[PDB]
Design a protein around this ligand. Structure first.
Ligand code: HEM
Ligand SMILES: CC1=CC[C@@H]2C[C@H]1C2(C)C
Ligand SMILES: [K+]
Length: 405
């Protein structure tokens, strides 16, 4: 159940939060983690769950720890420990200075520039899917939109056949939210097995997909190795199949239950980008961490070299010390403060692709299906993990209230 409290961890700082099955899941995953920001929970606690680790509960500490890579290394960023030890993805598993040369290469295959290209391809698919769904008056949002819209765009960017989705998506999820049929190590090895012949094939005969660009690129001037390309592409694949997919679902679940929120977007489409940020904060969903490089006193707490500390990017924006009424969605919110795309030298390279997907989704869905609700009676279930998400989201609406556009 719980790991024996290490001698150096204060008994009064213990708070056994379980990141893969938080107590409050029924109330909502963001709410379940929010329990860590309650009146008498300190800024830093120790949970004996998942092997034992620190958890920074407030954005101030979260931001600081992410900026201080000397003490909090990305070397072992995943929890549980075994998983963090096998996590060798590039460039997320490296700290500056060595990280940059690779981060630059990755920025080349998913950055703004690549996204402006993809713009029309992304609108076409969003419309394509929504219009095909419009007349039915119902859908399984997670499988009929949330998953194929972002994944197909990534599989297109990566130059990979769509039939590979079921397999890759299953591996990916075992890494963020393991159902237990596979360890992080097994999921990664299969992802590395998938790529290897594809990376060797595109190095032998260069194309113009994100994969070829990576296997054939350079780092600070020198040629990338096969193995280095593999570690980077696995990360890219990981960032493309399980982030926006889940986020679209928290956003649309909320919109289906907020008629007033929907109207505002119908009435004033010019605020969709702003709503996109507010939702990015409200339904933040990533939580990874770092490992202590040496013994280090942090905010009055003694951390030992080797201790893992989970720094929930999700919690910053939900922190009342960052945004008043944090649990409240307000598209007109003055200063939207958050760390949903991370913080420090590891800032999300895919955020520009993420915002673009989210915004076109908001624009095109509302423009064709302005009124919809959650299937009557449905009991929505979230799952918590490195990346939290929605199990299923049944949606219904009346086709008479829609419009081809
Ligand atoms: C709503 C969507 C997304 C969210 C909230 C998100 C969140 C994050 C977070 C929190 C990190 C930092 C991890 C750390 O510091 O350990 C990160 C890194 C990264 N993400 Fe995103 N991500 C999203 C979408 C994407 C997409 C679509 C891609 C590309 C296909 C992507 C690619 C990356 C990469 C390559 C990194 C690594 C940066 C580095 O390690 O320097 N992400 N992301
Ligand atoms: C967007 C992402 C790609 C890979 C893992 C999931 C995040 C990360 C925590 C860095
Ligand atoms: K590692």
């Amino acid at each position: 159940n719980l790991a024996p409290l290490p001698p150096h961890v204060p008994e009064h700082l213990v708070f056994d939060f379980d990141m893969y099955n938080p107590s409050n899941l029924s109330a909502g995953v963001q709410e379940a983690w929010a329990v860590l920001q309650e009146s008498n929970v300190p800024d830093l606690v120790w949970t004996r769950c998942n092997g034992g680790h620190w958890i920074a509960t407030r954005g101030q500490l979260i931001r600081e720890a992410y900026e201080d890579y000397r003490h909090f290394s990305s070397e072992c960023p995943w929890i549980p420990r075994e998983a963090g030890e096998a996590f060798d993805f590039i460039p997320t598993s490296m700290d500056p200075p060595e990280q940059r040369q690779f981060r630059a290469l990755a920025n080349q295959v998913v950055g703004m520039p690549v996204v402006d290209k993809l713009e029309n391809r992304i609108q076409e698919l969003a419309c394509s899917l929504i219009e095909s769904l419009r007349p039915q008056g119902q859908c399984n949002f997670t499988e009929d939109y949330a998953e194929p819209f972002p994944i197909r765009i990534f599989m297109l960017l990566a130059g990979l056949p769509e039939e590979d989705i079921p397999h890759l998506k299953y591996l990916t999820d075992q890494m963020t939210r393991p159902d237990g049929s596979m360890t992080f190590a097994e999921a990664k090895e299969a992802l590395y097995d998938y790529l290897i012949p594809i990376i060797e094939q595109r190095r032998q005969k260069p194309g113009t997909d994100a994969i070829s660009i990576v296997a054939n690129g350079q780092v600070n001037g020198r040629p990338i190795t096969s193995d280095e390309a593999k570690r980077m592409c696995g990360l890219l694949l990981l960032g493309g199949l399980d982030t926006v997919v889940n986020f679209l679902s928290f956003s649309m679940e909320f919109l289906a239950k907020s008629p007033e929120h929907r109207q505002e977007l119908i009435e004033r489409p010019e605020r969709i980008p702003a709503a996109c940020e507010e939702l990015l904060r409200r339904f933040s969903l990533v939580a990874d961490g770092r490992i202590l490089t040496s013994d280090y006193e942090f905010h009055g707490v003694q951390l030992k070299k080797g201790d893992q500390i989970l720094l929930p990017q999700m919690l910053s924006g939900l922190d009342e010390r960052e945004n008043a009424a944090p649990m409240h969605v307000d598209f007109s919110r003055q200063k939207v403060s958050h760390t949903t795309f991370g913080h420090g030298s590891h800032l999300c390279l895919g955020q520009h692709l993420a915002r673009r997907e989210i915004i076109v989704t908001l624009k095109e869905w509302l423009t064709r299906i302005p009124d919809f609700s959650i299937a009557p009676g449905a009991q929505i279930q979230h799952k918590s993990g490195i990346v939290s998400g929605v199990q299923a989201l049944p949606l219904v609406w009346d086709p008479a209230t829609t419009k081809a556009v």
